[PDB]
């Protein structure tokens, strides 16, 4: 019944706008050991459509045989993962500093899935080849059509990748945290009757 030790929550980072990707093609663990995070080459974020693209330079010394890739895929050497950032309220990424648990909101969650740009490139080149050889108001699009059109006709923003930022981020979070301690307003019973 009684408590031996309390692990205090501490909410901060209301403007940092953190994001989390969820790779849909690599296991969290290989064997009982943890897996190895892939090296990161480049990324893109669409502002309007909230699309994420991540490029991973895949291994070339084994199980590649670049002859096929240069034969019909123009020598592709990086695998791309595309994901949609979807809103999920009630999500907090947390860490532990000196037995004190710190939390920060996650704005969106992305499901990165493998994408094949070069297949679409070959398809559109073939379509041009077999279409140009022989011929053979105005606003009605809604629903997901407008979102796809926005994702197409937007302008991609090239991002920069940095590592080791965790120390500065943790320092900023704890500095934004330590200054404030809050006092309760309503009783427990007042929580039940309205969206428990």
């Amino acid at each position: 019944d009684p408590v031996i030790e309390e692990f205090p929550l501490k909410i901060s980072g209301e403007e940092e706008s953190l994001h989390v990707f969820q790779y849909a093609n690599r296991p969290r663990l290989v064997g009982r050991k943890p897996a190895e995070h892939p090296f990161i080459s480049a990324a893109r974020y669409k502002p309007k459509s909230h699309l994420w693209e991540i490029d991973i330079p895949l291994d070339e010394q084994a199980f590649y045989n670049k002859d096929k890739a240069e034969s019909e895929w123009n020598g592709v050497n990086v695998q791309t993962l595309k994901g949609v950032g979807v809103e999920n309220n009630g999500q907090y990424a947390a860490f532990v500093k000196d037995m004190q648990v710190y939390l920060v909101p996650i704005e969106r969650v992305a499901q990165l899935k493998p994408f094949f740009k070069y297949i679409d490139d070959a398809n559109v080149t073939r379509k041009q080849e077999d279409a140009r050889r022989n011929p053979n108001s105005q606003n009605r699009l809604t629903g997901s059509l407008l979102a796809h059109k926005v994702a197409d006709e937007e302008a991609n923003i090239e991002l920069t990748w940095a590592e080791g930022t965790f120390e500065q981020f943790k320092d900023t979070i704890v500095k934004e945290a330590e200054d404030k301690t809050l006092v309760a307003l309503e009783k427990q019973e007042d929580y039940i009757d309205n969206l428990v």
Binding site: Q22, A24, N25, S49, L51, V84, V86, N88, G90, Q91, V109, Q111, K113, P114, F115, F116, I119, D120, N123, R140, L141, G143, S144, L145, A147, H148, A151, I192, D193, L195, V196
Partner: protein, 763 residues
């Protein structure tokens, strides 16, 4: 002094406020209160095409209430309408805002037609009327109401029964060897059926719009699931036999060289036959087809195609489970898979079609006038609205009277919706209401819809059905039931996410079948770690009163899922909660109820009684008496003889009779000659049978007492001597007494009506 065995006193109180014919009344009241506002709010705005400055907008609508006067307008009494061969109705008042030249004229109380009121509604003149004022209006106080007086006749919209909308139904054909899963997605725009069938051992998806049967891997790839390992993990999970069945469908996508989302989308869009309206590219047509056409009720807005993909994946998982063994197919005839459409919904749909036609014709006439330059004050609406207003009431009256039901916008064709209320007896008039008509009548499949499934214990009558060709297709509601009402689902979604449901857009696809999944109205909504505690917490919040009591929660262990049902049309039954082997309704509550206070809704508010539908009953364990209570019990029946309907209540000692005799009496008690109503002499009906000296039954029934058959009986008590008096009683014949007939036994009279109209010819 009181005991628990007299808990049956909850039954009269339940009938004191709710009413026995509440199924029509509550639906019509809800229609008048809210669906008029919804119908106006859908398409209130009307614009011209020739002069783009004239806008006409309806603001508010009501029936029988003038805005200027607090008192409601005068309506003809129902019996006056019955005699004079009119339609009992109230005008439809609507607020209007339009432009007179440049002036923004707000005008009020313009009549757009007469809406035929249903008797004893909240808009009728017989609402909460004492028997003195009811006698003033030549109306019987012991009349169920709930019927529409049109053109002199009185018609009843019978409660329709359909297969549950927006639900996955899996059926197997063993002689042909095809398993399929069907979803009838019905919404305001379309009502389309999607099939997922198995052909030649491969899972195909077919739709009426699509020309060819799309392979399932193609549509799963097109719906956002690019990788095939994710597809296999979603459909099969960590299982051997399911993967062995399903690997062919993974191979099928590789055979057709489809590997990206664009490829599958254009492959699907090449097959879509409904191209019109200056079509876009094939890829965008396929996007539209996947977004709306394949499953209409789940619409996708953003780029994220997760929920539609998981819906199709769960449907195919059901299909694969059907392939593994054909015993795990849900029964189509199960009561929990059937929903009851009431009069209010059908009237709302018909009014929607009529109002759309009215607005279209009004816009056409306004454009016809305003196209010409000679316009004076923009040709005010109230001058040219009445000739279009008459069409609304003409359509409503014709649709109610003729019984034909033709709505072109929803492509729906119905016949035999309304029936003439049979006034052969008071019990016959009552039993015409609470009658459920099945969806199809052509099929003669024995042991199908006609057989009495055990799932209708206490929800439908177990003995009342007409004998003959319609035996089993026309059913009757039980004495103590309640048909649910439609509720919003987004607050339930938020409550689910609060209570511990992890969303689908943040959980693993591979581990999804390693724990229970939550379904809202048949659509997968997330995953739950502990399903039992979640179910218990949801039940406790329902019983407290923090969410609507008609929301149902039940855990299906075979599918390893937990379902929440919200939509209306589910048939329910109230029951007493028993906890820890003790019934939650003690003797003090019964004494409080009998003393006058603490009505049935107070029993609902304190968590003493609650409503269960069939699916909820599947998860319960109900005891029948106090002696049968064990610590594993979940609910307690209030009283068992509610399983017989209103008509079946006339039979004394029905449990001592063979069931076909009970059914025959249920059929033939509606032809009894007796008193019809308190005002049976002021009525002029086409054929009416009356008895000179009706008598009370010597052996009554509690059902007889509740439905007030005691006040208006049909039949006499006869001193019978069971013996073979002569040869004239052989083969069911009876031997009457001459002196008894002379003194008045069985004396009857018949009243017929001849009508004539002096037509005023055009000459």
């Amino acid at each position: 002094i009181n005991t628990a065995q007299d808990k049956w006193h909850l039954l009269p109180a339940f009938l004191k406020v709710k009413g026995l014919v509440k199924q029509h009344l509550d639906s019509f009241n809800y229609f008048v209160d809210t669906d008029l506002k919804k119908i106006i709010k859908a398409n209130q705005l009307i614009l011209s095409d020739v002069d783009p400055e004239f806008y006409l907008k309806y603001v508010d609508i009501r029936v029988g209430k003038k805005s200027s006067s607090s008192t409601k307008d005068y309506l003809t009494p129902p019996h006056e309408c019955r005699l004079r061969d009119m339609t009992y109705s109230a005008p439809i008042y609507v607020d209007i805002e339009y432009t007179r030249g440049r002036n923004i004229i707000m005008h009020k109380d313009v009549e757009i037609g007469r809406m035929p009121i249903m008797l004893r509604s909240n808009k009728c003149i017989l609402y909460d009327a004492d028997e003195s004022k009811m006698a003033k209006l030549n109306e019987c106080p012991l009349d169920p109401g709930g019927y529409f007086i049109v053109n002199g006749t009185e018609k009843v919209i019978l409660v329709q029964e359909q297969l549950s909308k927006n639900r996955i139904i899996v059926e197997a054909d063993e002689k042909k060897g095809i398993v399929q899963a069907s979803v009838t997605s019905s919404t305001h725009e379309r009502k389309s059926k999607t099939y997922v069938i198995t052909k030649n051992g491969k899972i195909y998806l077919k739709h009426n719009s699509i020309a060819e049967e799309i392979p399932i891997a193609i549509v799963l790839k097109a719906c956002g699931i690019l990788s095939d390992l994710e597809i296999m993990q979603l459909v099969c999970g960590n299982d051997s036999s399911y993967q062995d069945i399903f690997a062919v469908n993974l191979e099928e996508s590789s055979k057709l060289d489809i590997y990206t989302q664009q490829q599958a989308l254009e492959y699907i869009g090449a097959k879509v036959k409904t191209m019109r309206r200056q079509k876009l590219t094939i890829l965008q047509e396929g996007i539209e087809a996947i977004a709306t056409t394949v499953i209409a009720h789940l619409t996708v807005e953003a780029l994220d195609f997760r929920e539609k993909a998981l819906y199709i994946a769960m449907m195919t998982r059901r299909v694969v489970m059907a392939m593994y063994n054909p015993k795990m197919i849900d029964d189509r005839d199960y009561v929990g898979n059937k929903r009851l459409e009431l009069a209010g919904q059908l009237i709302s749909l018909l009014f929607e079609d009529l109002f759309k036609k009215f607005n279209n014709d009004f816009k056409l006439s306004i454009d016809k006038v305003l196209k010409k330059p000679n316009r004076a004050m923009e040709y005010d609406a109230l001058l040219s609205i009445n000739v279009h207003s008459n069409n609304i009431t003409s359509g409503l009256n014709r649709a109610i009277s003729t019984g034909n039901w033709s709505l072109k916008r929803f492509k729906m064709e119905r016949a035999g919706v309304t029936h003439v209320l049979s006034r052969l007896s008071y019990i016959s008039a009552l039993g015409m209401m609470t009658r459920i008509s099945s969806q199809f009548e052509k099929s003669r499949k024995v042991s199908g819809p006609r057989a009495l499934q055990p799932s209708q214990f206490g929800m439908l009558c177990t003995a009342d059905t007409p004998e003959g060709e319609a035996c089993g297709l026309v059913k009757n509601l039980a004495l103590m039931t309640h048909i649910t009402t439609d509720d919003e689902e987004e607050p339930i979604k938020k409550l689910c996410y609060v209570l511990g449901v992890e969303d689908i857009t943040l959980i693993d696809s591979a581990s999804l079948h390693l724990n229970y999944g939550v379904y809202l109205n048949g659509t997968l909504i997330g995953s739950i770690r502990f399903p039992t505690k979640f179910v218990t917490q949801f039940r406790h919040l329902r019983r407290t009163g923090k969410v609507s009591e008609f929301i149902s929660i039940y855990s299906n262990s075979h599918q390893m899922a937990v379902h929440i049902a919200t939509d209306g049309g589910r048939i329910c039954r109230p029951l007493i909660i028993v906890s820890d082997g003790q019934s939650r309704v003690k003797d003090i509550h019964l004494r409080k109820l009998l003393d006058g206070e603490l009505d049935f809704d107070d029993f609902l508010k304190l968590g003493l009684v609650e409503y269960l539908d069939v699916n909820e009953e599947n998860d319960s364990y109900i005891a029948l008496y106090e002696k049968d209570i064990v610590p594993s019990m979940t609910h307690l029946e209030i009283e068992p003889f509610t399983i017989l309907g209103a008509v079946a209540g006339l039979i004394p000692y029905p449990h001592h009779n063979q069931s076909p005799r009970n059914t025959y009496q249920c059929a033939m008690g509606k032809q009894a000659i007796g008193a019809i109503a308190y005002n049976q002499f002021k009525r002029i009906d086409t054929l009416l049978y009356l008895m000179t000296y009706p008598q009370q039954p010597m052996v009554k029934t509690k059902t007889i007492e509740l439905i007030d058959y005691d006040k208006l009986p049909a039949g006499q008590n006869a001193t019978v001597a069971v013996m073979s008096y002569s040869g004239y009683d052989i083969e069911d014949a009876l031997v009457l007494n001459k002196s008894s007939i002379d003194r008045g036994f069985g004396r009857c009279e018949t009243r017929r009506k001849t009508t004539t109209v002096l037509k005023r010819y055009a000459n």
